[PDB]
Design a protein around this ligand. Structure first.
Ligand SMILES: Cc1cc2nc3c(=O)[nH]c(=O)nc-3n(C[C@H](O)[C@H](O)[C@H](O)COP(=O)(O)OP(=O)(O)OC[C@H]3O[C@@H](n4cnc5c(N)ncnc54)[C@H](O)[C@@H]3O)c2cc1C
Ligand SMILES: CCCCCCCCCCCCO[C@@H]1O[C@H](CO)[C@@H](O[C@H]2O[C@H](CO)[C@@H](O)[C@H](O)[C@H]2O)[C@H](O)[C@H]1O
Ligand SMILES: CCCCCCCCCCCCO[C@@H]1O[C@H](CO)[C@@H](O[C@H]2O[C@H](CO)[C@@H](O)[C@H](O)[C@H]2O)[C@H](O)[C@H]1O
Ligand SMILES: CCCCCCCCCCCCO[C@@H]1O[C@H](CO)[C@@H](O[C@H]2O[C@H](CO)[C@@H](O)[C@H](O)[C@H]2O)[C@H](O)[C@H]1O
Ligand SMILES: Cc1cc2nc3c(=O)[nH]c(=O)nc-3n(C[C@H](O)[C@H](O)[C@H](O)CO)c2cc1C
Ligand SMILES: N[C@@H](CCCC[NH3+])C(=O)O
Ligand code: FES
Ligand code: FES
Ligand SMILES: [K+]
Lengths: 203, 197, 380, 407, 398, 248
């Protein structure tokens, strides 16, 4: 055994760079590394558990209502994680916020549930959720780094570049805070990956 | 009347793709042929125009607080109920494409199941529950959001078709340039930013 | 050692027109707007300075701004009795560094892509550099001009394969980058006149507040007449102000066949129809509803965008029918953003960028209808 | 437990309503029963199969067998079938091996095509007429260093009906064979002992199917001659498993049995008066021999015939006595061979080098009308790719050259 | 009748006098292999062979039965071949008067002749090569047929000869040729001409159509687009007026008619006029003693579409009726009168989108139909070559 | 098969629904208590009173905060159990709420309670600041905020959003301490007694009297905040009450 599956979907089969899953959440939370970090952990945790459960029922899932069953697993887990968190660790619960909806519709959670969980053993299926979320966070955190640093002078809320508004020298870039910057940054991340891993260039 | 204004909000002002950035995963994936993109856009309108009004009745008749019985609010059954409804229609959509399968069953492939779990479709139901839309407004909103989404996907397919003459560096070719194209498309859709209602 | 007839069947005569000559024609067409822009830029700045300062206070301001005492050194005068030479000289001290920065920074990206990818340099950058330099406020910091051209040249053009291979207008993509990244330097009341410490709203912004009665040149205290905006004796982007200068250049490139008159006609049609529609509807609250079409023409960057940027052939539609639709969408979008979008006083750049996205669709619709006629053998 | 209980039933009701619509849609939109596929429009050849699976699987089960080399990968393109109706549009991978003009006719890859609704097929007689026979091995002598001649005795009597240049698909199950089991003459054992190819041991994990061209002209009855080349790991990749099907054939000796699974092929000459040119290499000597024998007694053709075999050494050369007799008995046919590397003891005094350049420098260079000649080739890809390039450089249309590369 | 507004007439100096005179005697003639689209020759002659007027020189491998016969009787002095042994020219030195004769018929029977009989005579005489199909501009297959045969009785090429002047000298032959084409066509014969008057065919099948306007008005592709739009399943045949005269002569006298009237014109032509020559005439000998001093370019055909008459190609092309001599040194929509979106179509050819080009009307086009677009192209593309590359791709993949 | 599909969907639906329904209803009570304690923490936090722990917060809230009821239609104190007043519930009933017109509903809130609770901060025996709860519809969820207004009735001492459900990073930045701290020192009204707090898209000019930077990439959530303040500061909200505060 080896951690190939855990770390492969980081740079080889990245959910946002090679495949096109999870882009919607990528453009909203990559404005901060803090928000990005919680979302990466959330997608890793939800995808791995949901992938695991779907594997348990992989042989018995009907293709007619597979998505419904698959969604029930994902939505139920997200709802419960939200409810459990609200009652205990309420301070973090506010942090989850709308991420209950934002993880359920995350295409990575359902994408890996069908591509892998439905045709794999639960144990490696669980490893798939951890791995896919990591690669989602490589793109999420990498974009978050540029967007927060250049758009706010802050990384994880800690001021790296002094702002003019706070008697500093750096003027924040307003485009880094909006959606388009994430589109451009992700595209350029794909450019770097596919020029260093040419196997992925499209014909 | 008021409805025409609602339709304008959900097509241009609240363009789910280029304004709200919802449904980008399928939007940035099947956007390479106008004919295929148009087929998905038609299907998305069909799913959205049916999903939203149905969930509006279920929310206002079942999930609405103090609706089925006084003192019981089945609000916690909101995401699970909605996604399930959306998933059902998608499952049926998969079947109808079995008749129009050449253009989309094969191209959408892995994403055809993903019509559900699309940020655009789930989000539209949420706005129909966050805001308060009657059934008539829900239908106008749902159709409008889909049409605005179809406008964006079909447009990105038009741009990409025009790119047959483009010389995109390898590495950017396909997804990388598509993200850059979408960012530029969103740039031009920011023309409606000040527009209110 | 004997090529085949394919190589010999090449058309034996060609038109004198080439890509190099098209770009130089567009480059010269903006010279009248550029030269007036510099003259206007210096004139506006000098008037505001005398209105804000006098005596030794003016001298200190002139001494503390390299634009001002460099004009004094070269023979100009910052006093209100300054002639056209000093005004054009002062405006040049702002335009040229911006144009030089844009040319050098943008040119570096152009050559770098050609060098690394083994492409030959293309002359289209001459138009992109000059137009981008002519659509920014005179006070734009150089480091922001460098970033603006870098985004427009690289993100909008180079990554798409260079000249003739993109879909979005590069110069406007660069302007949009500065518009949304550093709005304070390219919007407001402190950037459209080059008099440090002077605050003045431009005509389009003033109309949205009160109307023609607000059309006042604060520096001079007088009134901004339709003639003033038409000639370009108004604050604004250096190059856009003079509708007359732009028409003179636009007439030449349109006559030469370089700029599409269907796009320009469509832009006018879209602008006139919607602005007139707003005029008829009326608005007791929104003053921009009552701006007539002829005022929309001479205000903001409508004239500059319509003539020299909406006519960018690569980013426009490739069909004659689409060209009408493309221009009409621009004119409609521009008035709409101008009138019913509170955030932006002008909407030409955003209008064109929106239209660029849909020009391929207009073409696709037109071409598919042609294909249907062909598959029916044109009813023959 | 207010609402905990209540939500569960209301939720189930919502789910039941949703599934019921889906199930109702499935009944009225998802076909039931079994899928009926018409083969050639003949009711007898029509196959009724339940939904699911690829077309290549269902067809093999019926009485019609479709030639396939890559299998369930959609790579070779030898399994093209005519789908008059059904089967949808052509998949993008299929277009890689099928031209658009062919797509208009209806050609599709059965393996890449998934059977999901009624489809119509028009398979020809050759694909329909596949007969499985298990001949008995007579001789397995080594013709050269890495080439073995295999003689098969027909079990049903008479002889296999096939065209010149045809081939028979040989199928073997999983089996472990050691190269030491091979019996080789001392003459050929020299390279084999230098590098010790006898060390290789092959373990075929799964049953395999391969193709082997014929080396017997149709008039030959009783013995089905064949030529087999031993598969050894690539010269550039020793870290590769050894031969699986060729090795199994080599392990056999007198009295052994193997399956031929009927004939197949699309390599044939043209029934015209144009001059014929043959370019053989390695195992290619099988189909070429059939052509020369077919055109000398089966047809008694008076057209000019030439043969150019590429060999590396005299030891590699085989079937020399037969070729010499045909050339001597009939002057219309002339054969030649060049050694790419003659041995010191060969003392060859004829053509030396590659037929890529030998044939050009001797015959085609001074040929007045090289284009007006049918060309037939079978040999290593290096020889084939180089020769076609040389033939193309002589203005020979592809329609005038037929390629049967064996790898 | 049909008026053309979108187009361009190049006003190049040295227009011909439009008076038929005798050109310099020609003692060398050639057939150009590369001119015939998709023609892979099967040689029937070798250097030093003696040939008759209508003797076969070579055959088409990919168009079986099509015979390319000599234009003159004489000796084969060379068979020029280029890269990959592509037949460049089969040069024949004119000598003698031997010829292959054929059947002759009365003028009142030509319209009534059996179709197969007409095809055989045209094929045996080599005159079958005058026909070109429009969806690929190839010589028609021997066994194929067309419901629409277009006769180009007009010439809007710059410096072109006036067809009326040439057709007028051979009125009986021209009418006889139209009658034969009347029987040859399954449908109709379109005599596409200018407003001027021409001899008329008494057959109801032969319809005269007038085209007026700038250059593209005189192209068979333009006439087909307006009268019989062509596709993969609607194939038209094209033949020019001088080949029609040859057809009439062949079926009236039983002999191959190889004389042609070509305009020798251009800025460096001292006396631009109409000159009598032979098919495949050597242009180096034809322009001898008629050009101004200096480095000039002899073009078989018009300056817009034509062959550089240099080296192995320095002979009059089969489909060329003019020789132009020159000194060595939204545009697309304005010169394209067809119902097409020219800028998008040209972009498809540049990109190699063969299937899209088919949808946009590439199949209706020959290289000459894109000459003006090439002329006015600021990027200096040569769309005629791109179209042929696309058309060859369609034939090959299709 | 019909038999397998009904069994799995029902069985899966039941197990997931039981877990979801049990978790939600059971933990709801604890969640409700935790949420209530949060509002006392928010009122104290905006008030500038540092408290820590649920028990300390309750102790310090009672000592320093004096909730009172106000009638919006008159802007005058009224008598009732302010400490146990639920303005949210009142706004849902026509008896203690009104329906706003399209013109009146600047905050996009469907209904507005007739009486709303305010919180008075008392350093000693005098009210040093007044905290006003204001809400308006956002893009994704309703946003509730506390605004600490000084005794002047014009100067704002602190701002905090105690119930937002917008996306963290974009719309959830109403919780960002830097954005909330930006409100301190701003003026709620103009000379004409008109709302002047304006959320400026792209960033307000530095030192602005009534300029708070809008939420980047979150115009709609920032629009809601403006819509929140545009209504509650208006005639039908706390406008009349703040007039009384300004003069004492
Ligand atoms: C029409 C036709 C006619 C043919 N006629 C002949 C003929 O007359 N004689 C003949 O010898 N062949 C012929 N072939 C080729 C035949 O199909 C086989 O390729 C050949 O017999 C060797 O069989 P193999 O499976 O052992 O080769 P393979 O094992 O498929 O060959 C692969 C190469 O790599 C090695 N290898 C083995 N296993 C692997 C593995 N898993 N991965 C990578 N490399 C591996 C092998 O040693 C060999 O060198 C013909 C093919 C066709 C289509
Ligand atoms: C998708 C987005 C596109 C990618 C590109 C975005 C990159 C954003 C980062 C750009 C870095 C900005 O870095 C910028 O450097 C300039 C260069 O002097 C500094 O500029 C500073 O010094 C100059 C020179 O004296 C002064 O004129 C200026 O007023 C002052 O701000 C800015 O304070 C800083 O903001
Ligand atoms: C073919 C050449 C193209 C040249 C340009 C084409 C002419 C286009 C004219 C459009 C119609 C006339 O445009 C007319 O402009 C006048 C000013 O002159 C406006 O005059 C006024 O009317 C409105 C109310 O109606 C007032 O609120 C406002 O002060 C002003 O717009 C008319 O409302 C408008 O109808
Ligand atoms: C923002 C303002 C501008 C936006 C509004 C105006 C643009 C409207 C464009 C709608 C989208 C284009 O719509 C386009 O229509 C053409 C016909 O013209 C269709 O064309 C095609 O349709 C079908 C596919 O459904 C094909 O089988 C057919 O061969 C072809 O006609 C395209 O498939 C469709 O994508
Ligand atoms: C008439 C004309 C107008 C042009 N306008 C622009 C423009 O507004 N902005 C720009 O960056 N390039 C412009 N160009 C240059 C060039 O065409 C443009 O960058 C294309 O998008 C790529 O070639 C123009 C060129 C011409 C001929
Ligand atoms: N395969 C693509 C082009 C990719 C080029 C790879 N170098 C076509 O279309
Ligand atoms: S569509 Fe939103 S995450 Fe995929
Ligand atoms: S088996 Fe090879 S493509 Fe079908
Ligand atoms: K405005």
């Amino acid at each position: 055994e080896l951690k190939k599956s855990v770390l492969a979907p980081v740079l080889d089969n990245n959910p946002i760079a090679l495949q096109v899953l999870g882009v919607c959440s990528a453009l909203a939370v990559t404005t901060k590394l803090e928000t990005a970090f919680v979302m990466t952990l959330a997608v890793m945790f939800v995808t791995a558990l949901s992938n695991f459960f779907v594997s348990l029922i992989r042989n018995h899932i009907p293709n007619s209502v597979r998505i419904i069953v698959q969604m029930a697993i994902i939505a139920s887990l997200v709802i419960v994680v939200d409810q459990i968190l609200k009652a205990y660790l309420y301070d973090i619960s506010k942090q989850l916020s709308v991420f209950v909806g934002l993880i359920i519709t995350n295409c990575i959670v359902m994408g890996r549930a069908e591509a892998f969980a439905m045709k794999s053993e639960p144990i490696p299926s669980f490893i798939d959720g951890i791995g896919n979320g990591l690669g989602y966070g490589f793109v999420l955190m990498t974009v978050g780094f540029f967007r927060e640093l250049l758009g706010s002078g802050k990384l994880f809320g800690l001021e790296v570049l002094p702002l003019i508004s706070n008697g500093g020298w750096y003027q924040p870039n307003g485009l880094m805070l909006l959606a388009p910057s994430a589109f451009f940054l992700i595209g350029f991340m794909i450019w770097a990956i596919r020029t260093f891993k040419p196997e992925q260039v499209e014909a | 009347e008021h409805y025409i204004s609602l339709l304008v909000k959900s097509i241009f002002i609240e363009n789910m793709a280029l304004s709200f950035f919802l449904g980008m995963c399928t939007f940035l994936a099947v956007s390479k042929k106008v004919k295929t993109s148009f087929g998905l856009g038609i299907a998305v309108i069909v799913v959205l125009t049916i999903s939203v009004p149905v969930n509006n009745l279920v929310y206002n008749l079942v999930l609405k607080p103090d609706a089925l019985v006084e003192g019981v609010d089945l609000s916690f059954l909101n995401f699970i109920t909605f996604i399930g409804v959306i998933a059902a229609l998608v499952q049926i959509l998969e079947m109808i494409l079995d008749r129009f399968f050449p253009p989309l069953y094969n191209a959408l492939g892995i994403f055809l199941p993903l019509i559900t779990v699309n940020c655009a479709i789930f989000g539209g139901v949420s706005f129909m529950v966050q805001r308060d839309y009657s059934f008539a407004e829900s239908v106008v909103y749902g159709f409008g959001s889909g049409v605005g989404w179809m406008l964006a996907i079909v447009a990105l397919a038009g741009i990409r078709e025009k790119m047959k003459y483009s010389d995109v560096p390898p590495g950017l070719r396909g997804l990388g340039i598509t993200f850059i194209t979408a960012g530029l498309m969103a740039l031009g859709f920011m023309s409606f930013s000040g527009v209110q209602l | 050692y004997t090529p085949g007839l394919v190589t010999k069947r090449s058309s034996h005569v060609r038109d004198s027109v080439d890509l190099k000559r098209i770009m130089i024609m567009v480059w010269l067409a903006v010279f009248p707007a550029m030269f007036w822009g510099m003259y206007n830029a210096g004139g506006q700045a000098i008037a505001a300075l005398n209105h804000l300062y006098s005596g030794d206070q003016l001298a200190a301001i002139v001494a503390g701004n390299w634009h001002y005492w460099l004009t004094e050194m070269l023979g100009g005068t910052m006093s209100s009795d300054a002639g056209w030479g000093s005004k054009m000289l002062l405006g040049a001290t702002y335009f040229l560094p911006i144009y030089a920065t844009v040319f050098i920074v943008g040119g570096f990206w152009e050559v770098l892509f050609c060098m690394v990818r083994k492409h030959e340099v293309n002359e289209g950058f001459f138009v992109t550099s000059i137009l981008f330099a002519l659509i920014v406020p005179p006070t734009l910091p150089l480091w922001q001009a460098a970033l603006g051209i870098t985004f427009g040249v690289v993100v909008a053009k180079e990554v798409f394969g260079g000249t003739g291979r993109n879909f979005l207008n590069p110069a406007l993509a660069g302007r949009a980058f500065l518009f949304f990244a550093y709005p304070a330097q390219i919007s407001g009341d402190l950037v459209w006149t080059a008099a440090d410490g002077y605050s003045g709203a431009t005509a389009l912004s003033q109309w949205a507040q009160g109307g023609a009665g607000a059309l006042i040149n604060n520096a001079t205290g007088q009134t901004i007449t339709w003639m003033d905006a038409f000639i370009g004796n108004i604050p604004g982007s250096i190059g856009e102000v003079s509708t007359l200068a732009l028409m003179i250049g636009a007439a030449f490139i349109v006559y030469m066949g370089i700029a599409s008159w269907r796009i320009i006609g469509g832009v006018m049609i879209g602008m006139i129809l919607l602005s007139t529609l707003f005029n008829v509807i009326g608005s007791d609250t929104n003053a921009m509803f009552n701006m007539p079409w002829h005022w929309h023409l001479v205000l903001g960057g409508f004239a500059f965008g319509m003539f020299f940027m909406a006519t960018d052939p690569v980013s426009a539609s490739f069909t004659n029918s689409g060209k009408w639709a493309y221009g009409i969408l621009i004119g409609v979008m521009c008035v709409l953003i101008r009138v019913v979008n509170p955030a932006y006083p002008e909407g030409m750049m955003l209008a064109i960028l929106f239209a660029n996205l849909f020009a391929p669709l207009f073409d696709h619709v037109v071409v598919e209808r042609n294909i249907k006629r062909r598959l029916a053998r044109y009813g023959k | 437990m207010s609402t905990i209980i209540f939500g569960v039933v209301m939720f189930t009701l919502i789910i039941l309503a949703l599934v019921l619509v889906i199930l109702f849609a499935k009944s009225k939109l998802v076909p039931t029963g079994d899928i009926t596929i018409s083969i050639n429009g003949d009711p007898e050849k029509a196959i009724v199969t339940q939904p699911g699976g690829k077309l290549l699987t269902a067809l093999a089960g019926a009485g019609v067998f479709v030639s396939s080399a890559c299998g369930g990968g959609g790579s070779c393109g030898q399994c093209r079938v005519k789908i008059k109706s059904g089967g949808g549009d052509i998949l993008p991978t299929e277009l890689d091996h099928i031209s658009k003009g062919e797509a208009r006719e209806g050609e599709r890859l059965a393996c890449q095509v998934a059977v999901k609704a009624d489809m119509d097929l028009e398979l020809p007689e050759e694909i329909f007429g596949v007969k499985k026979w298990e001949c008995t091995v007579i001789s397995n002598d080594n013709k050269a260093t890495f080439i073995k001649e295999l003689k098969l005795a027909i079990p049903d009597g008479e002889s296999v009906p096939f065209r010149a240049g045809g081939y028979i698909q040989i199928e073997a199950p999983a089996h472990h064979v050691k190269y030491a089991d091979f019996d080789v003459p001392e003459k050929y054992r020299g390279d084999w002992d230098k590098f010790n190819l006898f060390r290789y041991e092959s373990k075929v994990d799964e049953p395999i199917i391969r193709a082997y061209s014929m080396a017997n002209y149709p008039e030959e009855f009783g013995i089905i001659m064949l030529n087999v080349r031993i598969a050894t790991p690539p010269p550039n990749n020793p870290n590769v498993p050894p031969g699986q099907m060729s090795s199994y054939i080599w392990s056999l000796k007198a009295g052994d049995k193997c399956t031929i699974s009927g004939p197949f092929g699309e390599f044939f000459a043209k029934d015209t008066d144009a001059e014929m040119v043959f370019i053989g290499g390695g195992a290619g000597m099988a189909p070429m021999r059939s052509h020369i024998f077919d055109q000398l007694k089966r047809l008694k053709s008076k057209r000019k015939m030439s043969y150019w075999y590429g060999a590396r050494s005299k030891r590699e050369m085989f079937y020399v006595e037969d070729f010499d007799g045909l050339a001597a008995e009939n002057d219309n046919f002339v054969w030649h061979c060049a050694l790419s590397d003659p041995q010191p003891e060969d003392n060859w005094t004829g053509y030396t080098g590659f037929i890529h350049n030998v044939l050009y420098e001797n015959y085609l260079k001074d040929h007045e009308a090289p284009e007006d000649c049918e060309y037939y080739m079978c040999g290593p890809p290096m020889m084939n790719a180089a020769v076609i390039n040389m033939l193309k450089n002589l203005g020979v249309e592809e329609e005038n050259i037929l390629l049967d590369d064996f790898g | 009748m049909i008026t053309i507004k979108k187009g361009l007439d190049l006003p190049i100096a040295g227009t011909p006098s439009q008076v038929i005179s005798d050109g310099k005697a020609i003692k060398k003639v050639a057939l150009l292999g590369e001119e015939y689209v998709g023609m892979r020759p099967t040689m029937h002659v070798r250097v030093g062979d003696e040939v008759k007027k209508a003797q076969i020189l070579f055959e088409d491998k990919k168009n079986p039965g099509v015979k390319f016969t000599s234009p003159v009787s004489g000796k084969v002095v060379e068979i020029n071949r280029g890269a990959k042994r592509v037949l460049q020219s089969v040069v024949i030195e004119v000598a003698g008067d031997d010829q292959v004769t054929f059947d002759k018929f009365e003028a009142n029977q030509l319209a009534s002749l059996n179709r197969d009989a007409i095809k055989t005579q045209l094929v045996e005489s080599g005159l079958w090569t005058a026909f070109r199909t429009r969806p690929f501009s190839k010589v028609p297959a021997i066994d194929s047929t067309s419901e629409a045969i277009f006769v180009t009785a007009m010439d809007t090429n710059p410096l072109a000869a006036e067809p009326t002047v040439v057709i007028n000298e051979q009125s009986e032959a021209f009418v006889a040729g139209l009658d034969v084409l009347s029987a040859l066509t399954t449908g109709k014969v379109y005599v596409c001409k200018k407003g001027t008057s021409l001899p008329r065919s008494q057959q109801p099948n032969v319809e005269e159509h007038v085209f007026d306007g700038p250059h593209p008005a005189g192209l068979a592709g333009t006439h087909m687009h307006f009268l019989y739009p062509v596709s993969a399943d609607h194939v038209a045949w094209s033949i020019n007026y001088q080949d029609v005269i040859a057809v009439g002569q062949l079926f009236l006298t039983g002999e191959l008619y190889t004389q042609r009237v070509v305009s020798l014109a251009g800025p460096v032509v001292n006396k631009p006029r109409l000159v009598r020559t032979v098919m495949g005439a050597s242009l180096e000998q034809l322009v001898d003693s008629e050009i101004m001093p200096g480095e000039v370019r002899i073009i078989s055909g018009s300056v817009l579409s034509g062959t550089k008459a240099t080296g192995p190609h320095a002979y009059l092309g089969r489909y060329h009726l003019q020789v132009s001599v020159l000194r060595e040194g939204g545009n697309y929509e304005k010169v394209m009168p067809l119902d097409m979106e020219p800028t998008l179509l040209l972009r498809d050819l540049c990109a190699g989108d063969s299937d899209s080009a088919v949808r946009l009307g590439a199949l209706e086009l020959d290289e000459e139909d894109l000459a003006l677009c090439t002329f006015v192209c600021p990027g200096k593309y040569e769309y005629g070559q791109l179209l042929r590359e696309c058309l060859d791709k369609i034939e090959k993949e299709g | 098969s019909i038999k397998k599909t009904l069994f799995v969907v029902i069985a899966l639906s039941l197990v997931c629904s039981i877990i979801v329904s049990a978790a939600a209803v059971g933990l709801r009570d604890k969640q409700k208590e935790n949420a209530a304690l949060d509002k006392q923490s928010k009122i104290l936090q905006v008030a500038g009173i540092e408290a820590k722990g649920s028990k300390q917060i309750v102790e310090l809230f009672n000592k320093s905060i004096e909730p009172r009821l106000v009638d919006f239609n008159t802007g005058d104190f009224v008598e009732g159990d302010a400490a146990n007043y639920d303005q949210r519930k009142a706004a849902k009933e026509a008896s203690e709420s009104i329906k706003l017109t399209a013109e009146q509903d600047k905050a996009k809130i469907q209904r507005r309670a007739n009486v709303g609770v305010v919180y008075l901060v008392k350093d000693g025996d005098k009210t040093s600041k007044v905290i006003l709860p204001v809400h308006g519809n956002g893009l994704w969820s309703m946003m509730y905020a506390f605004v600490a207004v000084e005794t002047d009735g014009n100067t704002v001492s602190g701002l905090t959003y105690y119930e937002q459900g917008e996306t963290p990073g974009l719309g959830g930045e109403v919780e960002n301490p830097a954005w909330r701290a930006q409100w301190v020192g701003k003026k709620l009204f103009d000379e004409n007694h008109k709302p002047a707090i304006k959320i400026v898209k792209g960033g307000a000019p530095q030192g602005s009297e009534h300029g708070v930077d809008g939420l980047s990439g979150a115009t709609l959530t920032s629009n809601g905040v403006q819509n929140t303040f545009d209504f509650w500061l208006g005639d039908m909200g706390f406008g009349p009450f703040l007039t009384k505060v300004r003069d004492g």
